[PDB]
Design a binder for these strands. Structure first.
Lengths: 206, 60
RNA sequence: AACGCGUUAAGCGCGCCGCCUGGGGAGUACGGCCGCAAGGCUGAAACUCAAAGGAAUUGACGGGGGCCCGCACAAGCGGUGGAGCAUGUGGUUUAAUUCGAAGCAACGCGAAGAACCUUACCAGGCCUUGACAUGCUAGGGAACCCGGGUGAAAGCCUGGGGUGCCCCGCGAGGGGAGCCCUAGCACAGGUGCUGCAUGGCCGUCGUCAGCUCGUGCCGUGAGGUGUUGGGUUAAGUCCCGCAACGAGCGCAACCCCCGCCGUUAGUUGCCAGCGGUUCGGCCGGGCACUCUAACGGGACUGCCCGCGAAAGCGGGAGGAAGGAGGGGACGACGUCUGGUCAGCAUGGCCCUUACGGCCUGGGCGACACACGUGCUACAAUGCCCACUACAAAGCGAUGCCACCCGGCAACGGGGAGCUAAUCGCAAAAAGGUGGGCCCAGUUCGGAUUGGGGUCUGCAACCCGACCCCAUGAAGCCGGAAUCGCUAGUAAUCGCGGAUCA
């Protein structure tokens, strides 16, 4: 029925915009169309490294695409094979000067949108879903944190009765503002249904 | 008539009166904003993720 | 078995009697004995069932009890239910009047814009690897640009400009990377059915004060304690108690708007003070006011009096403001096989010269009727005309339009400022003032139909909005019923915005 997106509830504090610039009221329209089909193309051809963020900064014609990953290798190649073809590909729709980067996540178990995709892959390859969850939570809190939570939707085991599986440890005050709690969500896609996974990480405070 | 239509929206046949709006993500026909090019849902989904610069949770 | 029993045993033992062996049929029939009778004792069977039953959990419920809440009632003010009209639905109708939503929690709801578009529906004309994707084969054609005919359009038939390359190269010419005409194959497409196959998102109980975990202790076990009890709070808020001691999702707190004051900044503000003013903060001058938007201070039951073990309750001062200061955003474990396959996503099912696709016309706007949400009213605390004041939040380049000129006006010819605290929408309206109506179906009320016009649009017959003359219908305050709101609230008055010709 209810429970709102924990990102939208922070924006003003804590979480910052995953696309920050300014633009006019003939141009937001257009600069926005761009920003999706960008993040759309990247989502595909780059899944392999686990793009847990896709920032975009800007001033005028100068794009600051920064991709954040825990396994940086896959994006470059050794020296520069892959990174080459992408620069080409990006500006292949945008006749503007495409300035692409990469950044590192010290611990991927503390990046939710990852934790979510990990468990969604585990389900697509038929593993015990009660376990996979109770386990992925230890993974996170094990590697230092204050709290963490996961939620898998309906058609567990491919049963005609769709349920909803839970489990989570520590503290997760989604109602509190001075919080900082990373959220991500993944789609498992099977022969019988379409599951849904939600991941929550409690990190700092004050 | 869902696919055939979103494609009819792009072209501008006879008499410019016919040229209707249409959401970008959602093939949405109703509830479509000039400023964003988007539907009411399409929008609200985004706004929560930050993919729309400076569009913040209101409160007055 | 548990509830309980416990020298008045249901404990441990011995003696003798009576009795039970699944439920219905049935304490019935037959026979027998008894009885004045009513009936009594003794007492079956066929046929049929998957259980019938005892104690104890945890809930739910009560025309049970106790403590306590909420515009729940009560106190009070304004409404619907009646008329006329606008809009949503039932029904009948129809070639079709597309589908969904169904007590509260469907019905001015998806719909924040249906004349063709939309558009999913019907009638009529057409098109098949298709309006869109990915890849292969083959001669032409390899980009592209302008017309002809036919038709209602879609479509189908059909006349002319002719190619900047990797590169044999003076040249004939020729390999060829884009991209498109055409055949043909792999495939596209379906708002076709399944919201009890599903994700995500939303409604609701309910902003209610709750819902739980770990260990220990108790029970053969379901399960219990904790979380029952006394005080106190908006609150599982806090105190105090206690075989429990802690901890989590909740509430509160951190985040935004209104209130008071400071610091920073001066093309909005200011004779606040002298200055010139065609008297317009117009002008030079000037940030002290006002405002604008950015960083702060301020309130913590901290001070005093009383009540109390404590938490905290009542009362007083200072204060712009106290005891959550006024509004927001935020809604627990779960409930309704709740809602949505028609926003999208998605398993399965079904159609692949059509259940796909294109257009032209219709339909969604039908009307003997029925219900919901609304608008304008029936008038004097009123209606009409002239003149005259005081807002806020927003919005604007083939956009908002100053100011002119014409028209009774709708509007229409000119045309300055504007990327907008520097120009524009723009007058707020109720109010104030003075002139008219004099209790009437009326100078109240504006439905209906005739006549005449304007503007958007290719096009206003079915179906648009405005303006002018004339027509001026029903309504004299509404049966049974039934809604809202506790303060800048109800009532009443006008302004803006999304969608958008």
């Amino acid at each position: 029925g209810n429970k709102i997106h924990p990102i939208g509830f922070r924006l003003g504090i804590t979480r910052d915009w995953e696309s920050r610039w300014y633009a006019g009221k003939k141009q937001y329209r257009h600069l926005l169309l761009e920003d999706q089909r960008i993040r759309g193309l990247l989502e595909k051809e780059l899944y392999s490294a686990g793009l847990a963020r896709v920032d975009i900064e800007r001033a005028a014609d100068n794009v600051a695409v920064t991709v954040h990953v825990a396994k940086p290798g896959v994006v470059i190649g050794r020296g520069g094979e892959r990174i080459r073809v992408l620069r080409e590909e990006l500006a292949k729709l945008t006749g503007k000067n495409v300035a692409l980067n990469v950044q590192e996540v010290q611990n991927p178990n503390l990046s939710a949108p990852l934790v979510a995709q990990r468990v969604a892959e585990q389900i697509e390859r038929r593993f015990a879903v009660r376990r996979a969850i109770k386990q992925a939570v230890q993974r996170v809190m094990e590697s230092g944190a204050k709290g963490a939570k996961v939620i898998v939707s309906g058609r567990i085991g491919g049963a005609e009765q769709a349920r909803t599986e839970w489990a989570a440890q520590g503290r997760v005050p989604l109602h509190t503002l001075r919080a900082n709690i990373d959220y991500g969500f993944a789609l498992a896609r099977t022969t019988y249904g379409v599951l849904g996974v939600k991941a929550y990480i409690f990190l700092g405070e004050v | 008539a869902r696919k055939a239509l979103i494609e009819k929206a792009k072209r501008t046949p006879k008499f410019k009166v016919r040229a209707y709006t249409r959401c970008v993500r959602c093939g949405r026909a109703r509830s479509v904003y000039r400023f964003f090019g988007l539907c009411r849902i399409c929008l609200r989904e985004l706004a929560h993720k930050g993919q729309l610069p400076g569009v913040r949770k209101a409160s007055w």
